[PDB]
Amino acid sequence: YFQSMSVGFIGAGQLAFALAKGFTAAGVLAAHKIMASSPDMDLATVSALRKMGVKLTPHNKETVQHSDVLFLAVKPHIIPFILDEIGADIEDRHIVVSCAAGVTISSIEKKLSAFRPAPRVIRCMTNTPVVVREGATVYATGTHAQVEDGRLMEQLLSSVGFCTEVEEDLIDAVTGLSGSGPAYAFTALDALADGGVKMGLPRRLAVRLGAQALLGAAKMLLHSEQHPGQLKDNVSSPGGATIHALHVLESGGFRSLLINAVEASCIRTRELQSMAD
Amino acid sequence: MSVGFILAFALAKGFTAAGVLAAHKIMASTVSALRKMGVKLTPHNKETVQHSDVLFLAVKPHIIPFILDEIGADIEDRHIVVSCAAGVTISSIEKKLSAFRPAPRVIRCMTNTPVVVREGATVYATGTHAQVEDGRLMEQLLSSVGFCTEVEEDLIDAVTGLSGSGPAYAFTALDALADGGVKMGLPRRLAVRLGAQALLGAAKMLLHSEQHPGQLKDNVSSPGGATIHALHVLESGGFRSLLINAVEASCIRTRELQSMADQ
Amino acid sequence: NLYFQSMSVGFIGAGQLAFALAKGFTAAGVLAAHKIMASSPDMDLATVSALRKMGVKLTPHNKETVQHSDVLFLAVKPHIIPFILDEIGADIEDRHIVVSCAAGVTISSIEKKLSAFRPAPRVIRCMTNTPVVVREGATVYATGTHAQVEDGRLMEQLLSSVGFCTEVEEDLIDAVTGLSGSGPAYAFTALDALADGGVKMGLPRRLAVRLGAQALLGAAKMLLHSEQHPGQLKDNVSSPGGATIHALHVLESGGFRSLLINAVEASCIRTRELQSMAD
Amino acid sequence: NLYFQSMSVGFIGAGQLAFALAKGFTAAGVLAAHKIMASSPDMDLATVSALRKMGVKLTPHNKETVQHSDVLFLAVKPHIIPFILDEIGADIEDRHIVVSCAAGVTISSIEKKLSAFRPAPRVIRCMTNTPVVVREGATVYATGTHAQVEDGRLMEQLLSSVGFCTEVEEDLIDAVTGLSGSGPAYAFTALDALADGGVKMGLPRRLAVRLGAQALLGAAKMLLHSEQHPGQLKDNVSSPGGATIHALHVLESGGFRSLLINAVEASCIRTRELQSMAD
Amino acid sequence: MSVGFILAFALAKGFTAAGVLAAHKIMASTVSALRKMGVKLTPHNKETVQHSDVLFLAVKPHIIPFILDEIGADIEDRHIVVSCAAGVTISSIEKKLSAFRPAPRVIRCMTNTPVVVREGATVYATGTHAQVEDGRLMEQLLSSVGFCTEVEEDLIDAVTGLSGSGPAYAFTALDALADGGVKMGLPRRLAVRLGAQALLGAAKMLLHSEQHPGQLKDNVSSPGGATIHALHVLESGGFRSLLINAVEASCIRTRELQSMADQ
Numbered sequence A: 001y002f003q004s005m006s007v008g009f010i011g012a013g014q015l016a017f018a019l020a021k022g023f024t025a026a027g028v029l030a031a032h033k034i035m036a037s038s039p040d041m042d043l044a045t046v047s048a049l050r051k052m053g054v055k056l057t058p059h060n061k062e063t064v065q066h067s068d069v070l071f072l073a074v075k076p077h078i079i080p081f082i083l084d085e086i087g088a089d090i091e092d093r094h095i096v097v098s099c100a101a102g103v104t105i106s107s108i109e110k111k112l113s114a115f116r117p118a119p120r121v122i123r124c125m126t127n128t129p130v131v132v133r134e135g136a137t138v139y140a141t142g143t144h145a146q147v148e149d150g151r152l153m154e155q156l157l158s159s160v161g162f163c164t165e166v167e168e169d170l171i172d173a174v175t176g177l178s179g180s181g182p183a184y185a186f187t188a189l190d191a192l193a194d195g196g197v198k199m200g201l202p203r204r205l206a207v208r209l210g211a212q213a214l215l216g217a218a219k220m221l222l223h224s225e226q227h228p229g230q231l232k233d234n235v236s237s238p239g240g241a242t243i244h245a246l247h248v249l250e251s252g253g254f255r256s257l258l259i260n261a262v263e264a265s266c267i268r269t270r271e272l273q274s275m276a277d
Numbered sequence B, E: 001m002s003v004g005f006i007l008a009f010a011l012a013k014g015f016t017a018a019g020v021l022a023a024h025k026i027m028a029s030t031v032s033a034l035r036k037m038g039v040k041l042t043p044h045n046k047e048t049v050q051h052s053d054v055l056f057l058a059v060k061p062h063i064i065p066f067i068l069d070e071i072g073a074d075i076e077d078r079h080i081v082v083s084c085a086a087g088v089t090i091s092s093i094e095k096k097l098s099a100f101r102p103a104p105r106v107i108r109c110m111t112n113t114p115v116v117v118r119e120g121a122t123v124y125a126t127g128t129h130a131q132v133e134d135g136r137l138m139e140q141l142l143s144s145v146g147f148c149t150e151v152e153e154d155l156i157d158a159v160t161g162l163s164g165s166g167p168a169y170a171f172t173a174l175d176a177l178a179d180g181g182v183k184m185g186l187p188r189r190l191a192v193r194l195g196a197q198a199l200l201g202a203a204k205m206l207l208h209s210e211q212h213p214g215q216l217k218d219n220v221s222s223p224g225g226a227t228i229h230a231l232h233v234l235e236s237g238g239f240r241s242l243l244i245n246a247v248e249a250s251c252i253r254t255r256e257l258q259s260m261a262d263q
Numbered sequence C, D: 001n002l003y004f005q006s007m008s009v010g011f012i013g014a015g016q017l018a019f020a021l022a023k024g025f026t027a028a029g030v031l032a033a034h035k036i037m038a039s040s041p042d043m044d045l046a047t048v049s050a051l052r053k054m055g056v057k058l059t060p061h062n063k064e065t066v067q068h069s070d071v072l073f074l075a076v077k078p079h080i081i082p083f084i085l086d087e088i089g090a091d092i093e094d095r096h097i098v099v100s101c102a103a104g105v106t107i108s109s110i111e112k113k114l115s116a117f118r119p120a121p122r123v124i125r126c127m128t129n130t131p132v133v134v135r136e137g138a139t140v141y142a143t144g145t146h147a148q149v150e151d152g153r154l155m156e157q158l159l160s161s162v163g164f165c166t167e168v169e170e171d172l173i174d175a176v177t178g179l180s181g182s183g184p185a186y187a188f189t190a191l192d193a194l195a196d197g198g199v200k201m202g203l204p205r206r207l208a209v210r211l212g213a214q215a216l217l218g219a220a221k222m223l224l225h226s227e228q229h230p231g232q233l234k235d236n237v238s239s240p241g242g243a244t245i246h247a248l249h250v251l252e253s254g255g256f257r258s259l260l261i262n263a264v265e266a267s268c269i270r271t272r273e274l275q276s277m278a279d
């Protein structure tokens, strides 16, 4: 559905690389329609992106001039410097998609609006699994984003994962759930593998089994019309190994730790922004 | 090049062991150890400044402003003033010295005691008027006693929490590891030696490896074995979270000390 | 100073420990890579191909390793050792020194198996660790009933080329396993966590890893070159009111010291179990 | 060596600290009991009658203590000190050295009050503890703005007769309060608990109390006469595998060390609050 | 009277400092310290027995049976064999020695390192053939380096848990107290001195007092004050229960060691 559209990344780190790789693997954009810029790009990222077909430049202004959709994939405190640098180069045609945690549409529009009125701004929160086209993305549309800009954004990010529109005031909470969530999963998978190794499994097999168990269970829940508590009941046979293991999770307050984590990440996201303003 | 001190012993021993500085090219302002090594010693902090090209400030965060008020009139355009004082900001030094002559060349250093065996961890930040070659000279000199790299000043608190306080974390761990060896039947001297050799060897393995520390943990924990059993008991006590707590607590205290220096 | 540079070394097992020792010995230059042979069941291991790239001879036949070797290291999971000793017992010759690195496996259990084939097998029990790969291992050994005096000296000379090495009574080896055998894994865990702490406080992860590892290496070296107690070095570096003593307090409040005692004890007890489960 | 045996000493307050110092001074023989006067609101205290039996002069009038004294100790609850200084400020003479043992009460707050009456009051701030009663106190002092050089020496000579004594900067006294000021109560608590442990394991309570107190006295003396770190002495006395290292493990698992850090900190912070609540 | 050793240094230093024994009347089987004090030294454990009247065994619980098998033929009717070896029961000593001559006079001692400054805590139990005057002589000799009293042998495990391990508890407490002093701003050397002086003074106050330790706690905790605030934080961590745990753990380990000696 995207024939001539070109995409740019300001930033070439973990998230920009994941999105660019997922977009190209999706085939929704020709790789040569993608440009990425950063001032000191790691030579291994240069090599991988070049082999992918992505165009590269140190000059953010070239990315702006190449792009129709412009992703801001720098650290949150870098956003206002970027907006000052490129603000005079924003055109009517641009959609500016901020991926930065915490950074409000309001703050981006106030910077850009000093240069040309009505910047079209979308704020999104995604996660690194876009790199395997299983990301979880939400976006909120800015004051001057045309209704079709949101639709275009959704169609584009839907090619690398789940994607849905939210009110901007949910994004910090999403950040604490699906933005940080992969790190919770990787922590859990490392520990589950340690557990399998303690009970006699080779590490390589433990890592594989644990990751496959998690992927399968998550897919079961997504494809099920059932409450996760009901799936827990379905697979916990009376007197069995699983309900014994669930008891030891409950005794250490397992559930409360995950709630603590979502809360901690969301709150930190709010604090950082309140320091930015 | 001449170097002066006003952690002081550790760097002078490390420098001289490195052969980067002759001992006598170094004046100071513990005394029998320095005099033995060949280090000139003087009580009058003013003599140290007149003698030196690169001037280290190794005094408590409380004794820096009084050191600067004393020797401020004596700083020349040639000097590089390198501050290792915990929590003393570049701003508070420049502010004091600028009253005497403008554009003082100031570098803030965050190093640790293992420079004394030339295995320190050092970062430095360059001040307003430090020329580019001043920071290159600093890196070259401090690289002779360990790792050295440049950082922004606003990361020195974090570095303090990690490699600044780090050796104390390790000394604590080695004392406890030795208590464990002794509980299980080892003589104390053997337990201390083995535990310290295990930490050094593991740190070197990581430093020479292109591998994540978790990957090295994976590689050495055989299935069902003694090591994975022991890792589990570490995990059940929240071992990892305590070390995060420590880096955080030391970094945060350093920010409080920077606040006092800036007031 | 015994001459051993021309002798042949075999490993039964081609895993992490065999790789580590073979790498350390060849990097020390004390043995030629073609003097080393290793046998293993599974060849599609990363360690089998690493041995191959070093120039070590690889084979699936344990007898061939035994016939090649003068010094024979046993570096397989413990419960495997009786099946190995049954398989190769008839191939042990008078020239062989058998060096068991199998954790928990006692000299007695080895000598009992091997004695059924030839009397007076020369056996040495070894406890070492993976940092021999960077020539900073921590190794202890105990000599068996028929080990000659020069066997112990040869073992000490060889293993000193890749780190600290000293003779102990056999009844210490289980505690050594809990301390320096498992010790590197405690250190890797600590370094991961310290780097997470550095990242929490604003450092890039690569720098935090480097700084934390350098801090631990340097502190460990300081202690080894000091004649001082680790508590004295802790005292010497903790300035009044400063950042370090504040961090040490939060370590103490979580019982940091007790966790490391708990770990040494747990590893040592598990090592004792593994022997008892064998016997 | 200053001569002070004939001088007169007053205490405003007749509580535990006044009793302890008066007892310690008289037991050291450095002052005559009739040279000491103490004033207090309530006379039906056990400490008032103990002072009486020692031969100390007791009175309800703080002015009379001031007129009697050359050295004047303030040993009342802190919030009382401003009302005392208002009451007796006009009676301070040039001969007086005022020695405040009120915890937290700063030299500044005292000098400000007393300066309204006569300029240059000679003030010393003291932090001591109850074991001066057995001449084993731990005392520090800081000299005020108008304290002569000999005032500090006189104070050190006097307080050294009842224990350790040294001069400090005033900004250490709050931390000293948390450590050796409160320290005896930590020790009494520990001794009660250790004796309960002895009773649990079969000892009669009287013996357990004696053995535990003697163990602590002896260990403390060993440390003071050693040039060694307490961790080194801990190492020296903990035999491998033995009873002591097993007990030290259970101490560590409850975070014993952190509780004592917590206590010093809590006492020091409370002392800082009490000054701030005053100011 | 002649005394021999085969904790050994601590008693010999304490005895000689006490003037109860001339240094040369003592033979032993750390070496420069003893030789300096005037203590005869010999490698051959047999020479020590021939020299001595009262014979101390200061070796690991593991090295006692081999010491007894060595010198057993040399024990005479005059000897009192005093064992300080941790966990070695009177029964296991008498059993070994009785093979050589019947009725060996054996005393089991539980003392601690502060005998080196003559403030030890010692209990002793008399063996099957120890005459009444043997235990009186023991009490008189050990009273010169600290407290000494007789107990039943089945209380020595408890005493071990309390005053045997006690000094290690105190060294640990003094290190932590000093960390606390340092955290709050004190120099380390001052913090160590003050904390040790506070413990010594408090222990002496209790020893000289006719008062319960809780009464002394009450007497020194002023209402609302710094001390009662600090006691509360001790209570919230279960401080008292940890010390009970410690005495129990050391006593129980001593019973396990007695079981090994008796097997």
Ligand SMILES: NC(=O)C1=CN([C@@H]2O[C@H](COP(=O)(O)OP(=O)(O)OC[C@H]3O[C@@H](n4cnc5c(N)ncnc54)[C@H](OP(=O)(O)O)[C@@H]3O)[C@@H](O)[C@H]2O)C=CC1
Pocket: A010, A011, A012, A013, A014, A015, A016, A037, A038, A039, A040, A041, A042, A060, A072, A073, A074, A075, A076, A078, A081, A082, A099, A100, A101, A125, A126, A127, A128, A179
């Ligand atoms: N990683 C994740 O899981 C997620 C990240 N995000 C958000 O995405 C943004 C980036 O995250 P991440 O990719 O992890 O951070 P990285 O640190 O991995 O990459 C940061 C990038 O910003 C670049 N950069 C810095 N200054 C400039 C500049 N002046 N002009 C252009 N590029 C510059 C860096 O350049 P150089 O290459 O020269 O260093 C680097 O390429 C953050 O705001 C984060 O919140 C959102 C969801 C999840």
